[PDB]
């Protein structure tokens, strides 16, 4: 990769120092809960349209590991099966983390109103969604959940892998430890949102972290993001920045070519 | 039939040593019966009151808008005691009330309450204080029109 890891580490250290110095002027709580954003600038639009299902990048240092993070899980019918699974055969950390289990029918019934959607949006930090019903969640959750990319429902696979299914007699679910592993992986994963834009922002860590962990997360996100989600791979990549919510952007990678290819250069 | 099925399920739960609340959930119904609804209004439990326009004797409901106004309850006068009876499985119903609904219908109830307040109560706020009747018959109306025309001409 063209990205220099030493320069990435220098950027992480300088950004953390600047965030601390700005927050010093509770201080520790202000330094904490401050996300670190990795910003990718491309030469063309990274996608043709708005894709409302985030891509997951698995990190050596997973996110949302704090115990105060509340997770809402949106499944297919019935919700009773998954609620009993969480209450009975889930590990205690995930049982404490999962604050709500609701199926799609109950979601469409009780959260059609915009103010109800906003209340549900405020009550949780991370939303997970079964892939059987995730294409219906833009309609059920509206622009309340999808104007902003921060709390979009993350895809999880809960379906058993190979008429109308009756939810009561069969749930068509994969085994519970596999569900637990999938949920833990998706909670920890970094999220990539594809929009018809030259700008993609990915949350890689917080300001209370260590610069080594931040740089490692930045490196793996850069690799997986350019490989998987960027058309024309490193040829389309123009700029790479690291920034805080109120800080400036530190370039970690910048290009020498401002054009896509030689076909863009015409005489 | 629904009550018979529910009682059979509760008898089954009692037989297997469970409370009836374990197999039965809290019900949400339209409240009816005039004495019951007047009690709910006085206890300020009713959220919306619908009163039939054709109760005979009229004294049974003639105090109801004043009572609802004193308790701050949204009410509306609606046409049909038979129409309200179709709600409550009876031939007629003098009055119906809603106290509480389910969570998926709470928004619909609040929108209906706001619609009742803005489109019925505000529109009848002045006309409810007026005297009714005093309409003249057809031939008498024509007689007074002719008399006034003759007086204006002469």
């Amino acid at each position: 990769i063209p990205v220099d890891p030493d320069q990435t580490l220098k950027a992480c250290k300088a950004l953390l120092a600047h965030i601390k110095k700005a927050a010093a002027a509770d201080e520790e709580s202000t330094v904490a809960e401050t996300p670190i954003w990795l910003t990718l600038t491309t030469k063309k639009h990274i996608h043709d349209s708005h894709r409302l299902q985030p891509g997951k990048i698995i990190l050596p240092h997973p996110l949302n590991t704090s115990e105060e993070i509340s997770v809402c899980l949106i499944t297919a019918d019935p919700q009773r099966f998954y609620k009993n699974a969480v209450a009975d055969e889930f590990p205690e950390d995930l049982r404490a983390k999962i604050g709500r289990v609701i199926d799609i029918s109950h979601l469409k019934a009780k959260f059609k109103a915009y103010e109800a959607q906003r209340k549900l949006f405020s009550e949780h930090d991370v939303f997970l969604a079964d892939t059987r019903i995730i294409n219906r969640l833009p309609k059920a959750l509206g622009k309340t959940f999808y104007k902003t990319t921060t709390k979009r429902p993350i895809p999880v696979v809960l379906m058993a892998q190979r008429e109308k299914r009756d939810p009561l007699e069969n749930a068509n679910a994969r085994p519970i430890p596999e569900i637990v592993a999938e949920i833990r992986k998706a909670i920890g994963a970094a999220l990539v949102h594809l929009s018809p834009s030259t700008n993609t922002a990915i949350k890689v860590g917080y300001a209370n972290w260590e610069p080594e962990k931040l740089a490692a997360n930045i490196e793996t996100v850069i690799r997986e993001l350019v490989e998987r989600f960027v058309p024309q791979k490193w040829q389309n990549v123009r700029n790479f920045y690291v920034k805080g919510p109120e800080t400036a952007a530190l370039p970690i990678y910048q290009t020498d070519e401002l054009w896509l290819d030689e076909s863009k250069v015409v005489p | 039939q629904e009550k018979k099925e529910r009682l059979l399920r509760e008898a089954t739960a009692i037989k297997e040593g469970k409370k009836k609340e374990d197999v039965s959930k809290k019900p949400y119904t339209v409240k009816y019966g005039l004495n019951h609804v007047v009690g709910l209004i006085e206890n300020k439990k009713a959220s919306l009151v619908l009163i039939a326009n054709d109760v005979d004797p009229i004294e049974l409901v003639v105090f109801l808008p004043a009572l609802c106004r004193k308790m701050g309850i949204p009410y509306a006068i609606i046409k049909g005691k038979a129409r309200l009876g179709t709600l409550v499985h009876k031939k007629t119903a003098a009055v119906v009330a809603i106290t509480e609904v389910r969570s998926e219908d709470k928004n619909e109830l609040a929108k209906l309450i706001s619609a009742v307040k803005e489109g019925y109560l505000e529109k009848v706020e002045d006309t409810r204080k007026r005297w009714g009747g005093g309409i003249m018959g057809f031939k008498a109306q024509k007689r007074e029109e002719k008399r006034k025309k003759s007086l204006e001409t002469a």
């Binding site: 109103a113 103010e115 109800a116 209340k119 | 009690g39 006085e42 206890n43 300020k44 959220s47 004193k70 308790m71 701050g72 309850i73 509480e100 709470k106 928004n107 109830l109 609040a110 929108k111 309450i113 706001s114």
Partner: peptide
Amino acid sequence: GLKADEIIAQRSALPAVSVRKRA
């Protein structure tokens, strides 16, 4: 809470009238 809940529960300042103490 919800504005819908407030609108449904809105009453007047007059206290409630009870026939008797209830269980």
